[PDB]
Design a protein around this ligand. Structure first.
Ligand SMILES: *P(=O)(O)CNC(=O)Cc1ccc(I)cc1
Length: 359
């Protein structure tokens, strides 16, 4: 294997047209091919300041942050601190509403609680209002019957999962996930010293960065560079190489199949499809019309351990960023696409599929 010059061509040929069509300012790309990460960088991080995109440029991950939440939860499970079968109420006893009765930790993690909203209401700014919000929520469906992708669901999962540890979320994440994996440039809160590397997102011509929100850290607040992200993919595609025993298992727990929703499988943060899969299947499923809709689930009990022959992926966006990650453990290939403009899901998926198709 080589084709290095061929590889650089494949990427350029796919990304070049993408940036022109969706008018993306800058993009950092990583292709993992036979245990070796390959970095590609394009455009600008900061238009005004005319700063180019570099392997050290920090991007906002949006929903890709949920894969971190998934692994942290997995690790806690693996440590014995938590169980997917546990009642939510075991961790948050204040949640006295009769409606919380049959809801488990698993439901929160996999969006099956019964219709918790996509977003935490903007009116919620503190513990009091947060508690209130959850206490008054009226489920539209019964637990374990319908999947409704929501921040308010996995957001709470993450907040609760770290209780037994005694450490606040950001601390638990750094200590148990980042440190061990040597993800030294992965932040929840970017330090002053690193700020020079923090790119500007672009929306309606305006430069923008993500704002603070309740459960932001747990659902969409991670910031990284293409370097750490590539290392994240590698750790997930080949967990046998992870030294920490609970982390190792945590990763396997996050890639396990808990529910069946047509052709896709819901993991902890991660979403999977059986490989081989047709492009249209992946692309079509990524559109908001499908991705954000309430759909019936089929339980996988016991949960199926990770399948090598899968298409593991996750899309993520912020007001001004658009990211995508995909890998096939069987083939030892992966891709990372970080952009500073939020462009349609389908286009990210199509682009990633095509490069990976050059297997
Ligand atoms: P996910 O699929 O990447 C989607 N992203 C987020 O919900 C979070 C978000 C949405 C709107 C703004 I403005 C900021 C963050």
């Amino acid at each position: 294997p080589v084709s290095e010059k061929q590889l650089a061509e494949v990427v350029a040929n796919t990304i070049t047209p993408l940036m022109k069509a969706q008018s993306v300012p800058g993009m950092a790309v990583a292709v993992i091919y036979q245990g070796k990460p390959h970095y590609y960088t394009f455009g600008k991080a900061d238009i005004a300041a005319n700063k180019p995109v570099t392997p050290q440029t920090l991007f906002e991950l949006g929903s890709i942050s949920k894969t971190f939440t998934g692994v942290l939860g997995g690790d806690a499970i693996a440590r014995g601190e938590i169980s997917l079968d546990d009642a939510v109420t075991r961790y948050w006893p204040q949640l006295t509403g009769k409606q919380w009765q049959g809801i488990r930790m698993l439901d929160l993690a996999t969006y099956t609680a019964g219709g918790l909203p996509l977003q935490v209401p903007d009116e919620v700014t503190d513990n009091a209002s947060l508690l209130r919000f959850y206490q008054n929520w009226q489920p539209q469906w019964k637990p374990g019957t319908t999947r409704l992708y929501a921040n308010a669901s996995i957001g709470l999962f993450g907040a609760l999962a770290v209780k037994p540890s005694g450490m606040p979320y950001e601390q638990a994440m750094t200590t148990r996930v980042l440190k061990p994996l040597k993800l030294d440039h992965t932040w929840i809160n970017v330090p002053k010293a690193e700020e020079a590397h923090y790119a500007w997102g672009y929306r309606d011509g305006k430069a923008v960065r993500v704002s603070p929100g309740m459960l932001d850290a747990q659902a969409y607040g991670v910031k990284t560079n293409v370097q750490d992200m590539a290392n994240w993919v590698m750790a997930n595609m080949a967990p046998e190489n992870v030294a920490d025993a609970s982390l190792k298992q945590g990763i396997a727990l996050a890639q396990s199949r808990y529910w069946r929703i047509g052709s896709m499988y819901q993991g902890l943060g991660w979403e999977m499809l059986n490989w081989p899969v047709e492009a249209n299947t992946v692309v079509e499923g990524s559109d908001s019309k499908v991705a954000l809709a309430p759909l019936p689930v089929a339980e996988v009990n016991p949960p199926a351990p990770p399948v090598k022959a899968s298409w593991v992926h996750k899309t993520g966006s912020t007001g001004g960023f658009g990211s995508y990650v995909a890998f096939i453990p069987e083939k030892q290939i992966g891709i990372v696409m970080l952009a500073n403009t939020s462009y349609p899901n389908p286009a990210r998926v199509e682009a990633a599929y095509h490069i990976l198709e050059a297997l």
